Each structure stands twice: as C-alpha cells, then as structure tokens.
Design a protein around this ligand. Structure first.
Ligand SMILES: [Ca+2]
Length: 223
C-alpha cells in the first residue's frame, strides 16, 4: 500500500496473509474454512496466516492453517486478468473471535463514489521498494466505469473496477494482490492489477466480487 497508514494490530480481522515460506499475497476470510484471493496468486504449498499484524513476529493472535484445496475461477484468463478470483479451503476451521473474523459477501454491487478500505503488506513505495512488517490500510473511493476505461483503454471488463485517486500517490501495490477492498462492511473487491503503483492516471484495478457471489456460494456448498 502506497500513501496509506498503519491499520493497527488486528483491526482488519478478515485480512489474511498467504505464505509459502514468506508472505506473497493477501486474501479475505469469508467463513471459518474459506478464503477469497486473486487467481493470479495461485501456487501450491499455501499456508493461510490469520490474525496477523507483524508478519515477521509471533505476537499471539495468529492462526496458521494449511490449504487443503485451491479453486481458480473456471474462466480466469492470466493474460487479461479477467475473472481474477480464487477460493482456498482451509484444512481445519479457523477459530473465530474479535481478531479473526469473516467478512460478509456483498448482496449488491457497489457504486462509484463509495468509500472503501484496502489493506495489505505490499510495497509502500511507488519508485523503489520497501515492504512493511505491519498491515497497511488505505481509504479510497470506487471510480466511475467511464474513468476506469479511460485510464486503461481496451483493458477493463465487466468483472473489474477501479478505485483510488487519479492524481496518484495513494494505491495498492506489489504484495497487496489478492487482498480485500471492503465497502460498508462488505467485500466488494480483490486487489488485482494496475500499471505500476500510485501513478497519475493509473489507479488500481480490482476484481468485482459481487459478480462472483453465486459461484462462491455454490462452490462452498459442494466442496
Ligand atoms: Ca505475526
């Protein structure tokens, strides 16, 4: 997260870190046994880390649970990033508490102008590299479809939205991928892609979760 703030320990209780020896992506806990992330975060050997603040220090609220199954969206296209969503099932159910909690799926899609909370352990610099140990947060509005498409001609599908600031300076970045965009207490986005980070006229692009609620629910119901 570039241009954000330190969230505070365990203040984003649905935020998970995906670990394969190291943090490599975010995700969102949606019930005691399932996480939503980005398909472009797929790999084998995932351990889901819940209850994290400092990802390099055991602070006492963590739960580390291996993935038993990963399910990339049936229509994910890694070239266009259309349908950039995956589900991860945990080998055991997380113990839910005030610091480890699920985030509701959206009943309805969100509109441009709605404020959201974007979070992660990604790079905090737009030029160069600095990775935080503690969770970072950014408040950002959803941008209109027309301004998203104008920023990225020929690239924005109906399964994507932009959020952030056209002036630059505030954005998600490398290592935030797969993490949450939460608006009015609902998971509306997944950190997906953008050109660089925090550049003028290049806001972040996010997977539009409301399009996937039916698939999420039916996948959970049979897996
Ligand atoms: Ca920790």
């Amino acid at each position: 997260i570039v241009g954000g703030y330190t969230c505070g320990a365990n203040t984003v209780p649905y935020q998970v870190s995906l670990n394969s020896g190291y943090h490599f992506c975010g995700g969102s806990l949606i019930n005691s046994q399932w996480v939503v992330s980005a398909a472009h975060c797929y790999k084998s050997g995932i351990q889901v880390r819940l209850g994290e603040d400092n990802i390099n220090v055991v602070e006492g609220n963590e739960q580390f649970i291996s993935a038993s199954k990963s399910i990339v969206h049936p229509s994910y296209n890694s070239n266009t990033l259309n349908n950039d969503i995956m589900l991860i099932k945990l080998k055991s159910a997380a113990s839910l508490n005030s610091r480890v909690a699920s985030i509701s799926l959206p009943t309805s899609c969100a509109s441009a102008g709605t404020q959201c909370l974007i979070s992660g352990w990604g790079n905090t610099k737009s030029s160069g590299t600095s990775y935080p140990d503690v969770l970072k947060c950014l408040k950002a509005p959803i941008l209109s479809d027309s301004s998203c498409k104008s920023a990225y001609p020929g690239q924005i599908t109906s399964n994507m939205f932009c959020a952030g600031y056209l002036e630059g300076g505030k954005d998600s970045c490398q290592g935030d991928s797969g993490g949450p965009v939460v608006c009015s207490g609902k998971l509306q986005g997944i950190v997906s892609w953008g050109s660089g980070c925090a550049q003028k006229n290049k806001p972040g692009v996010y997977t539009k979760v409301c399009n996937y609620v039916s698939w999420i629910k039916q996948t959970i119901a049979s897996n």
